Amino acid sequence: STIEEQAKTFLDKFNHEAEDLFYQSSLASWNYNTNITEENVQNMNNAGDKWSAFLKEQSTLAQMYPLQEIQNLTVKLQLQALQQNGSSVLSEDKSKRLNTILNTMSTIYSTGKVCNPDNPQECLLLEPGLNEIMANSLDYNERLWAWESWRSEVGKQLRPLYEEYVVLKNEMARANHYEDYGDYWRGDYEVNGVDGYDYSRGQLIEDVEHTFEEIKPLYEHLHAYVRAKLMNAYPSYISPIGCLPAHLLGDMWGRFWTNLYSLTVPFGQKPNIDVTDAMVDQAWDAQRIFKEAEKFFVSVGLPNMTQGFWENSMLTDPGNVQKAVCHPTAWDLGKGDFRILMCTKVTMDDFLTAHHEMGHIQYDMAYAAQPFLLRNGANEGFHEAVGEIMSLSAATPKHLKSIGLLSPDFQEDNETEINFLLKQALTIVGTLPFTYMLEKWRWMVFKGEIPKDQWMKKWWEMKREIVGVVEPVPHDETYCDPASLFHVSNDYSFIRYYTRTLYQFQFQEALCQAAKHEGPLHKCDISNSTEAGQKLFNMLRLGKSEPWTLALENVVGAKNMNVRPLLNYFEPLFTWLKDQNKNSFVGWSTDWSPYAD
Amino acid sequence: TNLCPFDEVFNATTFASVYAWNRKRISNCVADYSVLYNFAPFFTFKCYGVSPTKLNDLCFTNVYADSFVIRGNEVSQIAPGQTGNIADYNYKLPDDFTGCVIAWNSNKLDSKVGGNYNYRYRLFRKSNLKPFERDISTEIYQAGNKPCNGVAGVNCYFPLQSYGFRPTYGVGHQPYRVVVLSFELLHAPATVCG
Ligand SMILES: *[C@@H]1O[C@H](CO)[C@@H](O[C@@H]2O[C@H](CO)[C@@H](O[C@@H]3O[C@H](CO)[C@@H](O)[C@H](O)[C@@H]3O)[C@H](O)[C@H]2NC(C)=O)[C@H](O)[C@H]1NC(C)=O
Ligand SMILES: *[C@@H]1O[C@H](CO)[C@@H](O[C@@H]2O[C@H](CO)[C@@H](O[C@@H]3O[C@H](CO)[C@@H](O)[C@H](O)[C@@H]3O)[C@H](O)[C@H]2NC(C)=O)[C@H](O)[C@H]1NC(C)=O
Ligand SMILES: *[C@@H]1O[C@H](CO)[C@@H](O[C@@H]2O[C@H](CO)[C@@H](O)[C@H](O)[C@H]2NC(C)=O)[C@H](O)[C@H]1NC(C)=O
Ligand SMILES: *[C@@H]1O[C@H](CO)[C@@H](O[C@@H]2O[C@H](CO)[C@@H](O)[C@H](O)[C@H]2NC(C)=O)[C@H](O)[C@H]1NC(C)=O
Ligand SMILES: *[C@@H]1O[C@H](CO)[C@@H](O)[C@H](O)[C@H]1NC(C)=O
């Protein structure tokens, strides 16, 4: 009779219809992702299309129950999720234009190629050509050519599209009562109407900047050290006080500094840890890898994988006959069906990735009992954080020795751990100012704070000031280097990686405390610790039925994001960098550039 | 001195969906519950009123055998007093129950790769079913106060939802063929012996 009762009944109808239709779509998508055939391309599309149509119909139907007369917080959550119409608040004309622009930019990124200045029929795509250059090449001119030509051939195409994309997405977001599209994205972290746990959309900005301020020392010392090493590798190119050149950072954008490891390893002779040879020497196959992942998760009290997981998952490259999409993925098809798709190689990289993806699966099985709409992480940063802490635990020498791959006569010293922590910082800490700055530039462009005529001009200022990176070629406003990354020209919020990095170390620290771990945090393995597993399941079982702040407090006992676990994980390498830089400039000047002579 | 349906019920072709469970009068005949209890693939063989093989030594007036199909989470409800989704909207066990509940998997046959929607439940009903009651009526549910003269739409839904049975389901969401043996015994002539 009341509005909340009718809304409860509407959602009851919706959940069952949705389980069936979403299972249809996921199975066709699997079909395709395992057994490539034009046919079940068509099946994936038709199934996903019926699913999309069902969602639009149920969203129009859901907007007929106002949240203003609904009290059950969980009901209000589900209805608010089904009510976010999105791009259907624009005119149909503007929605078709927005979608046209999105598809054009996506296919420009995926099909943008550059051809060498000596052979107009030999070209490289981003993946794999230019990526292989930027990840493996040590020659300066080859790297510079790759960088500049990717941003001029394909970025120049993306400039006007991105301008119109800004206009349309700001219209879309202002039409759903957000101040701009960036505020719309920040709406993921929003929590209203639960006393002691609320969280606003600008509070995300404030906490991101406040925690980044605390990260700044660790990053400045890492930057000065990487500069010392690269300047040893490129004397006539890098200034000892200037920014790092953009095209010598490891990948196409300087998103991760991991590929600089060869050029900056502190103790370049100390043996690095890799158990691949041992797995092959003890006759390990993919079956054995995933069995060990299952064993790890069981060791802390979690359930072992369902019989469906073993009957249905694709854990190897299925030969040459049928092609498959080998990107490691974890699938929750719903209705009790969990799978992993991974073309596993008997290596340590794939060994760690297996525990990462099985952590995804464990998270899915925990909140399986929640309603359909609340079967997800606490916010956009919880799944990947959960997956990361599994690789953290299973990578440690204590665990590798535990499962028989590493011999008990392995000597952990003060050099090999510095090599390890430096690789970890090159991957993890290295991406943090990059991510913060990129999403900040986006947030300002969406809020209207950067005029079009200054877009790139602001970008490369922000590159110089926050990240410590200078562009090797002056760029006027004909470019759109932001869009030259996968995540800007395909419409994805980026702050998720910053938040995920911080979350994963809060998790790992809280769990290692519950596991009574002595010593530095990075060495910790949470195996055989049912109390850590219980403390984690207390948050995994929630899904997104409680505020993300409350889910976080369930693990770490704190209600807000916090950098101190990151800095604690990296404190040994912090002090080591402070020592190594005693004969180096720490910081950077923003006005030096390789082209200004 | 004839034997009781033995294979007619258990080893059948297809079971009825749960909203329209068929009930068969198992009477005037000697039952083989002595040696059928020992087959043992059943995933839930629990008699909530009497001993399993001892009950041979006690004739009953009119054993009722109700046969239908559910899933593993639905099996937890075919129980006296348990009111989940299925024991209060289609087939409720009386609180004073005395008979048997036999449950086994059924994936191999009652689930088909592509959505066997033959087997259905009731999810909506104006009132909670009363002990040992069958409702099969396809009247549209009157959730919204508004008149829903056979109308299918806002706040009024088809009260029958089909299990989208499929092989690749979790053991809890999988099909289970399930038979309830209501043992009754009173002054009426007891002609079900063993
Ligand atoms: C990947 O998808 C293809 C596309 O269906 C699968 O090919 C199928 O392979 C099965 C045997 O493995 C065959 O089934 C045949 O189906 C036809 C049509 O229903 C039927 O008339 C035949 O008697 C037979 O049952 C057939 O080659 C083909 N089925 C089709 C075309 O529907 C392939 O098996 C899949 N790969 C995997 C991982 O199984
Ligand atoms: C908001 O709406 C939900 C949806 O109905 C309400 O939660 C419901 O609470 C009832 C009664 O406590 C639950 O029924 C219970 O079922 C269990 C079977 O597991 C049984 O053991 C109990 O005896 C009881 O009958 C029902 O599960 C639950 N709905 C769920 C969990 O989805 C809730 O009370 C409303 N308000 C708040 C503040 O949550
Ligand atoms: C999946 O988990 C079950 C439940 O814990 C495991 O069953 C245990 O198995 C060990 C060794 O096989 C026994 O010592 C325990 O007594 C069992 N306990 C229970 C409650 O069953 C099972 O081992 C796991 N699956 C497989 C295939 O090993
Ligand atoms: C987690 O517990 C298991 C069981 O005790 C440990 O594995 C055993 O270690 C002993 C001694 O090294 C050996 O007999 C076997 O290799 C294991 N199995 C059994 C049944 O004892 C395991 O080492 C523990 N985890 C860690 C990190 O030590
Ligand atoms: C690591 O151990 C060696 C052992 O002789 C020592 O000389 C060295 O000083 C230690 N580490 C550092 C950072 O100096």
mmCIF file of N, CA and C in Angstrom, chain A residues 1 6-7 9-10 12-13 16-17 19-20 23-24 27 61 65 307 312 335-337 339, chain B residues 85 114-115 117 121 123-124 141 143-145 154-155 157 161 164 166 168-171 173:
data_model
loop_
_atom_site.group_PDB
_atom_site.id
_atom_site.type_symbol
_atom_site.label_atom_id
_atom_site.label_comp_id
_atom_site.label_asym_id
_atom_site.label_seq_id
_atom_site.Cartn_x
_atom_site.Cartn_y
_atom_site.Cartn_z
ATOM 1 N N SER A 1 0.827 -1.200 0.000
ATOM 2 C CA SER A 1 0.000 0.000 0.000
ATOM 3 C C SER A 1 0.866 1.256 0.000
ATOM 4 N N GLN A 6 5.636 -1.114 -2.230
ATOM 5 C CA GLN A 6 5.583 -1.310 -3.674
ATOM 6 C C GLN A 6 6.972 -1.295 -4.292
ATOM 7 N N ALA A 7 7.883 -0.478 -3.755
ATOM 8 C CA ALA A 7 9.255 -0.475 -4.256
ATOM 9 C C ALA A 7 9.972 -1.778 -3.917
ATOM 10 N N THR A 9 8.516 -4.660 -3.636
ATOM 11 C CA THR A 9 7.981 -5.657 -4.561
ATOM 12 C C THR A 9 8.543 -5.479 -5.971
ATOM 13 N N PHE A 10 8.681 -4.228 -6.423
ATOM 14 C CA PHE A 10 9.297 -3.970 -7.719
ATOM 15 C C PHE A 10 10.702 -4.547 -7.774
ATOM 16 N N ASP A 12 11.850 -6.905 -5.972
ATOM 17 C CA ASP A 12 11.777 -8.359 -5.894
ATOM 18 C C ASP A 12 11.569 -8.970 -7.276
ATOM 19 N N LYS A 13 10.625 -8.422 -8.046
ATOM 20 C CA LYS A 13 10.484 -8.816 -9.449
ATOM 21 C C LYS A 13 11.796 -8.622 -10.211
ATOM 22 N N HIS A 16 14.893 -11.238 -9.787
ATOM 23 C CA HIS A 16 14.809 -12.543 -10.430
ATOM 24 C C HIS A 16 14.941 -12.405 -11.944
ATOM 25 N N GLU A 17 14.199 -11.453 -12.528
ATOM 26 C CA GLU A 17 14.361 -11.206 -13.959
ATOM 27 C C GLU A 17 15.821 -10.905 -14.288
ATOM 28 N N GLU A 19 18.691 -11.733 -12.514
ATOM 29 C CA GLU A 19 19.547 -12.911 -12.435
ATOM 30 C C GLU A 19 19.494 -13.692 -13.737
ATOM 31 N N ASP A 20 18.285 -13.964 -14.241
ATOM 32 C CA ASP A 20 18.208 -14.776 -15.457
ATOM 33 C C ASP A 20 18.863 -14.062 -16.644
ATOM 34 N N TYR A 23 22.667 -13.642 -16.322
ATOM 35 C CA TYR A 23 23.362 -14.906 -16.527
ATOM 36 C C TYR A 23 23.444 -15.234 -18.012
ATOM 37 N N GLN A 24 22.355 -14.987 -18.750
ATOM 38 C CA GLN A 24 22.392 -15.114 -20.207
ATOM 39 C C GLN A 24 23.562 -14.328 -20.795
ATOM 40 N N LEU A 27 27.071 -15.584 -19.891
ATOM 41 C CA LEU A 27 27.432 -16.836 -20.546
ATOM 42 C C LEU A 27 27.759 -16.626 -22.019
ATOM 43 N N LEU A 61 11.101 2.220 -15.005
ATOM 44 C CA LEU A 61 10.128 1.724 -14.038
ATOM 45 C C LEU A 61 10.523 2.072 -12.608
ATOM 46 N N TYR A 65 9.354 5.235 -8.233
ATOM 47 C CA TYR A 65 9.302 5.184 -6.771
ATOM 48 C C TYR A 65 10.279 6.212 -6.225
ATOM 49 N N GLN A 307 32.734 -26.901 -7.149
ATOM 50 C CA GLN A 307 32.958 -27.884 -8.203
ATOM 51 C C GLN A 307 32.714 -27.282 -9.577
ATOM 52 N N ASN A 312 34.397 -25.712 -14.990
ATOM 53 C CA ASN A 312 34.056 -24.713 -15.989
ATOM 54 C C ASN A 312 35.137 -23.679 -16.276
ATOM 55 N N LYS A 335 24.213 -16.813 -9.631
ATOM 56 C CA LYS A 335 23.489 -18.064 -9.413
ATOM 57 C C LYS A 335 24.451 -19.217 -9.129
ATOM 58 N N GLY A 336 25.466 -18.944 -8.308
ATOM 59 C CA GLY A 336 26.383 -19.960 -7.831
ATOM 60 C C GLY A 336 27.499 -20.353 -8.772
ATOM 61 N N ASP A 337 27.729 -19.606 -9.848
ATOM 62 C CA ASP A 337 28.704 -19.988 -10.862
ATOM 63 C C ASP A 337 29.850 -18.985 -10.845
ATOM 64 N N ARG A 339 33.981 -18.572 -12.153
ATOM 65 C CA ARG A 339 35.011 -19.101 -13.035
ATOM 66 C C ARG A 339 36.191 -18.143 -13.103
ATOM 67 N N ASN B 85 10.952 -18.906 1.210
ATOM 68 C CA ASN B 85 10.136 -18.498 0.075
ATOM 69 C C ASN B 85 9.105 -19.542 -0.317
ATOM 70 N N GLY B 114 20.076 -24.220 -21.569
ATOM 71 C CA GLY B 114 19.351 -23.230 -22.339
ATOM 72 C C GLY B 114 18.075 -22.764 -21.672
ATOM 73 N N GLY B 115 17.931 -23.064 -20.388
ATOM 74 C CA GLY B 115 16.813 -22.541 -19.632
ATOM 75 C C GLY B 115 15.564 -23.394 -19.686
ATOM 76 N N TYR B 117 12.505 -23.882 -18.419
ATOM 77 C CA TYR B 117 11.584 -23.086 -17.621
ATOM 78 C C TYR B 117 10.293 -23.830 -17.287
ATOM 79 N N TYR B 121 7.996 -21.847 -9.525
ATOM 80 C CA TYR B 121 7.414 -21.605 -8.211
ATOM 81 C C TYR B 121 6.409 -20.465 -8.252
ATOM 82 N N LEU B 123 5.961 -17.056 -6.271
ATOM 83 C CA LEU B 123 6.690 -16.127 -5.417
ATOM 84 C C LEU B 123 5.802 -15.052 -4.819
ATOM 85 N N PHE B 124 4.586 -14.884 -5.333
ATOM 86 C CA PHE B 124 3.667 -13.854 -4.879
ATOM 87 C C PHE B 124 2.316 -14.486 -4.574
ATOM 88 N N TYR B 141 -1.046 -10.915 -9.291
ATOM 89 C CA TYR B 141 -0.881 -10.443 -7.924
ATOM 90 C C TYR B 141 -1.264 -8.975 -7.799
ATOM 91 N N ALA B 143 -0.450 -6.298 -5.922
ATOM 92 C CA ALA B 143 0.477 -5.626 -5.014
ATOM 93 C C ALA B 143 0.117 -4.157 -4.869
ATOM 94 N N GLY B 144 0.081 -3.435 -5.982
ATOM 95 C CA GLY B 144 -0.472 -2.100 -5.961
ATOM 96 C C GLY B 144 -1.964 -2.154 -5.702
ATOM 97 N N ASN B 145 -2.441 -1.201 -4.903
ATOM 98 C CA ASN B 145 -3.863 -1.136 -4.591
ATOM 99 C C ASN B 145 -4.707 -1.015 -5.856
ATOM 100 N N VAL B 154 2.523 -2.598 -13.672
ATOM 101 C CA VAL B 154 3.001 -1.920 -12.475
ATOM 102 C C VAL B 154 2.363 -2.531 -11.235
ATOM 103 N N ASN B 155 3.207 -2.872 -10.261
ATOM 104 C CA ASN B 155 2.766 -3.392 -8.966
ATOM 105 C C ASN B 155 1.784 -4.551 -9.105
ATOM 106 N N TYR B 157 2.128 -8.548 -10.952
ATOM 107 C CA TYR B 157 3.029 -9.426 -11.679
ATOM 108 C C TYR B 157 2.454 -10.833 -11.746
ATOM 109 N N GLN B 161 7.077 -17.681 -11.237
ATOM 110 C CA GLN B 161 8.409 -17.499 -11.795
ATOM 111 C C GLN B 161 9.036 -18.868 -11.997
ATOM 112 N N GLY B 164 15.118 -20.906 -13.924
ATOM 113 C CA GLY B 164 15.868 -21.038 -15.154
ATOM 114 C C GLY B 164 16.905 -22.136 -15.053
ATOM 115 N N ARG B 166 19.649 -24.891 -15.336
ATOM 116 C CA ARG B 166 20.780 -25.034 -16.236
ATOM 117 C C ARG B 166 21.797 -25.933 -15.554
ATOM 118 N N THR B 168 25.134 -25.676 -15.350
ATOM 119 C CA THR B 168 26.288 -24.987 -14.774
ATOM 120 C C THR B 168 25.937 -24.110 -13.577
ATOM 121 N N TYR B 169 25.067 -24.585 -12.694
ATOM 122 C CA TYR B 169 24.626 -23.833 -11.529
ATOM 123 C C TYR B 169 25.352 -24.327 -10.283
ATOM 124 N N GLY B 170 25.373 -23.484 -9.253
ATOM 125 C CA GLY B 170 25.862 -23.929 -7.962
ATOM 126 C C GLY B 170 24.969 -25.002 -7.371
ATOM 127 N N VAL B 171 25.579 -25.887 -6.574
ATOM 128 C CA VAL B 171 24.857 -27.030 -6.014
ATOM 129 C C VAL B 171 23.629 -26.570 -5.233
ATOM 130 N N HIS B 173 21.793 -23.849 -6.145
ATOM 131 C CA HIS B 173 20.845 -23.355 -7.139
ATOM 132 C C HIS B 173 20.471 -24.422 -8.157
#
